[PDB]
Amino acid sequence: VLSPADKTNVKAAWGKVGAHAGEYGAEALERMFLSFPTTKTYFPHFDLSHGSAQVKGHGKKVADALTNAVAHVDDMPNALSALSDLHAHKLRVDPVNFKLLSHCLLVTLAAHLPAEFTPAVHASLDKFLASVSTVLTSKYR
Amino acid sequence: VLSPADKTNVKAAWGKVGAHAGEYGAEALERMFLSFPTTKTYFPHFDLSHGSAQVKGHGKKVADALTNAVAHVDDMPNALSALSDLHAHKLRVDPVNFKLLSHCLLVTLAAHLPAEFTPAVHASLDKFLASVSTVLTSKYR
Amino acid sequence: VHLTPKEKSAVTALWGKVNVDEVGGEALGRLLVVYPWTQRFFESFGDLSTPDAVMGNPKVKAHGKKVLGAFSDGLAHLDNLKGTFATLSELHCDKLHVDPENFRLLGNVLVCVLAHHFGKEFTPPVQAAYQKVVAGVANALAHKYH
Amino acid sequence: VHLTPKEKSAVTALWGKVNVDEVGGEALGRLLVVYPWTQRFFESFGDLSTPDAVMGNPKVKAHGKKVLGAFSDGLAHLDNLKGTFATLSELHCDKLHVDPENFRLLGNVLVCVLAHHFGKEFTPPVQAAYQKVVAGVANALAHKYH
Numbered sequence: 352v353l354s355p356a357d358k359t360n361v362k363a364a365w366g367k368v369g370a371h372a373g374e375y376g377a378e379a380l381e382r383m384f385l386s387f388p389t390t391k392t393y394f395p396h397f398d399l400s401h402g403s404a405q406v407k408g409h410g411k412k413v414a415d416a417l418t419n420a421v422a423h424v425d426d427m428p429n430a431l432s433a434l435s436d437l438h439a440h441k442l443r444v445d446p447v448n449f450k451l452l453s454h455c456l457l458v459t460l461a462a463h464l465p466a467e468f469t470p471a472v473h474a475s476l477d478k479f480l481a482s483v484s485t486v487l488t489s490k491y492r
Numbered sequence: 493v494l495s496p497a498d499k500t501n502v503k504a505a506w507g508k509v510g511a512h513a514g515e516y517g518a519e520a521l522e523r524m525f526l527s528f529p530t531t532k533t534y535f536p537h538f539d540l541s542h543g544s545a546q547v548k549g550h551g552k553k554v555a556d557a558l559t560n561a562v563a564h565v566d567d568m569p570n571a572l573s574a575l576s577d578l579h580a581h582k583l584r585v586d587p588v589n590f591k592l593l594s595h596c597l598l599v600t601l602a603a604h605l606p607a608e609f610t611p612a613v614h615a616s617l618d619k620f621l622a623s624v625s626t627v628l629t630s631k632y633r
Numbered sequence: 634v635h636l637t638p639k640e641k642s643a644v645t646a647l648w649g650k651v652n653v654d655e656v657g658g659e660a661l662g663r664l665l666v667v668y669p670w671t672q673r674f675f676e677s678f679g680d681l682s683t684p685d686a687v688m689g690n691p692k693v694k695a696h697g698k699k700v701l702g703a704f705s706d707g708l709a710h711l712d713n714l715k716g717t718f719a720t721l722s723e724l725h726c727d728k729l730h731v732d733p734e735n736f737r738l739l740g741n742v743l744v745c746v747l748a749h750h751f752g753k754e755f756t757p758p759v760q761a762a763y764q765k766v767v768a769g770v771a772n773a774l775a776h777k778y779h
Numbered sequence: 780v781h782l783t784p785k786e787k788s789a790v791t792a793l794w795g796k797v798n799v800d801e802v803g804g805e806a807l808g809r810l811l812v813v814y815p816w817t818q819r820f821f822e823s824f825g826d827l828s829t830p831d832a833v834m835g836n837p838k839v840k841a842h843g844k845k846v847l848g849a850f851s852d853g854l855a856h857l858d859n860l861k862g863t864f865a866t867l868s869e870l871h872c873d874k875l876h877v878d879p880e881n882f883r884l885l886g887n888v889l890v891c892v893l894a895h896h897f898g899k900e901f902t903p904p905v906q907a908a909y910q911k912v913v914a915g916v917a918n919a920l921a922h923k924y925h
């Protein structure tokens with residue numbers, strides 16, 4: 352569960368990402384695909400080379416979804432419900448893979464926004480990503 | 493995140509516990525202490541022999557804490573608020589132990605209420621226990 | 634894995650009363666129900682939509698007997714679980730790509746099934762022993778990924 | 780564990796550019812902020828209340844250099860990470876009772892800190908190699924419980 356300090360720290364850190372979202376969501380996916388090869392298997396219809404249009408396009412979608420979760424943070428289950436249908440029932444994604452993308456997403460954030468990645472903001476973001484992961488992996492229909 | 497089906501399956505199953513609350517909560521803790529001894533370290537001030545009045549007393553509270561949580565299931569962070577300060581801040585309990593007690597709690601229920609423990613109610617109870625385990629382990633002040 | 638003789642005696646007497654035709658199907662069946670992402674490794678198994686369909690599915694029950702077969706194999710050579718499963722770990726890990734966590738879970742749903750099956754008989758000390766066993770099969774099923 | 784030679788060139792190069800006085804206490808320091816239950820294993824370290832207290836804490840930077848000294852050691856003997864840590868694992872597992880998930884976590888906050896420090900330099904393939912390292916350190920540090 353997110354604290355009043357957690358919620359705002361995320362909003363102010365994802366706000367600094369801003370226009371760079373699609374680029375970060377793209378780097379996170381590629382970091383995940385290279386670093387954890389077993390994750391590639393969820394994307395067999397994908398063009399998985401560096402500079403793919405698919406992963407650059409998917410990254411915008413992933414980053415935008417997370418931007419939606421920053422927008423509706425006090426009610427993420429209500430917000431991400433078409434996405435849970437997708438990842439939980441349709442895709443049956445293992446939550447271990449969510450820990451992986453969440454880790455690569457923190458690495459990306461750490462690589463790009465050094466002044467934003469305070470231990471406190473790192474804490475809140477990990478927590479935030481753990482929460483979207485729960486929702487997206489849980490069937491609550 | 494619990495489903496409308498989860499919410500009621502837990503209400504209908506933990507309801508058939510009833511007066512048996514403290515006895516189960518005590519068996520659960522015992523099953524945990526014996527199966528996983530590293531969890532005893534969290535209870536140095538405790539009388540841990542079989543039949544202990546503290547364990548059987550703690551069991552009533554653990555079991556009532558869960559009944560309290562089945563009451564305000566749609567808003568567990570607010571309910572278990574006093575309990576999170578205890579296990580997250582004060583005790584600094586590793587979330588793995590929660591996985592262990594949650595497992596032993598299911599085993600106890602599996603052993604006692606076989607007519608209630610359908611694949612469906614098991615699934616719902618694992619999720620329920622996972623949810624209180626997140627609340628108790630996270631700092632949300 | 635080394636279990637003290639009072640326990641060792643009890644984990645064999647309990648496995649003796651085991652319906653070597655249903656328990657295996659309840660373990661794997663409950664695994665696919667309680668942890669939905671496990672269904673992804675069983676696409677060639679048909680209908681898995683409802684918990685009743687997962688339970689009533691013949692392939693679940695059929696596979697479950699071999700999985701239970703491995704546990705009996707591991708219960709007999711409890712001195713060297715890493716060896717008897719040295720081949721199982723290759724199939725599941727280096728080839729099939731089953732995440733190590735799913736091994737502890739099935740081992741624990743199985744524990745929940747033996748509890749469902751025996752009731753009061755599945756006492757705290759009989760669980761404690763079976764945990765060391767199912768923990769050992771897991772740590773031995775993940776041997777060729779570690 | 781074996782690293783393909785392009786990756787091995789990069790990992791050693793990156794560790795050459797590392798501040799063997801700060802990054803260690805930042806990795807161990809971020810472990811106690813992000814995952815505050817780890818604070819439990821450190822009662823003899825004093826003030827760990829706020830994230831500022833944790834990071835500025837002298838024992839954290841001190842112990843952190845030793846933890847960084849552990850990775851450094853294993854980065855060299857990347858042929859047998861298991862033996863070099865065979866001693867470390869006894870201390871942490873069968874004695875200090877540290878759950879193995881925390882070993883996966885520390886090695887990932889380190890990866891976050893390397894990233895924090897190197898920015899663009901810590902590239903996807905550099906991460907990809909450093910993951911295999913820190914995972915191998917973990918799989919070896921949990922060898923005396925597994």
Ligand code: HEM
Pocket residue numbers: 390393394412413416417434438442444448449450452453483484487
């Ligand atoms: C930070 C967590 C994640 C977010 C917010 C996220 C978000 C999304 C979104 C927005 C889509 C596009 C679907 C659409 O609108 O058409 C998607 C699709 C998908 N995601 Fe995720 N996802 C997450 C984690 C994962 C993980 C970790 C995996 C597994 C490795 C995964 C696998 C997929 C797959 C296989 C699809 C469908 C691919 C497609 O659209 O062609 N997702 N995800």
Ligand code: HEM
Pocket residue numbers: 531534535553554557558579583585589590591593594621624625
């Ligand atoms: C299903 C999860 C759990 C619930 C609902 C639960 C509930 C409670 C409650 C109601 C108390 C009584 C405290 C009081 O009122 O004085 C408590 C105390 C305690 N719990 Fe838990 N607990 C859970 C899990 C755990 C776990 C897994 C551990 C660690 C192995 C743990 C360790 C403790 C300790 C050390 C105390 C304080 C004992 C005391 O009051 O003297 N609890 N818990």
Ligand code: HEM
Pocket residue numbers: 671672674675677696699700701702703704724725729731735736737739740770771774
């Ligand atoms: C707790 C450890 C487990 C045991 C004891 C176990 C045991 C077995 C055994 C004995 C076989 C048949 C031998 C063969 O045909 O080669 C097998 C096959 C298989 N197992 Fe496991 N298994 C375990 C966990 C898992 C898990 C967690 C998954 C996936 C969620 C899994 C997926 C499979 C699959 C896909 C097959 C191949 C047959 C098929 O499904 O088409 N196993 N397992």
Ligand code: HEM
Pocket residue numbers: 817820821823842845846849850867870871875877881882885886916917920
């Ligand atoms: C990547 C895994 C880890 C590495 C590389 C590591 C390394 C070390 C080293 C080199 C020492 C000092 C040598 C000695 O005292 O003999 C040590 C001690 C210790 N480690 Fe770790 N450690 C690891 C994980 C952990 C974790 C996750 C925790 C906490 C849950 C932890 C807590 C401690 C503590 C409390 C000590 C004893 C020193 C004291 O009294 O403060 N370690 N560790």
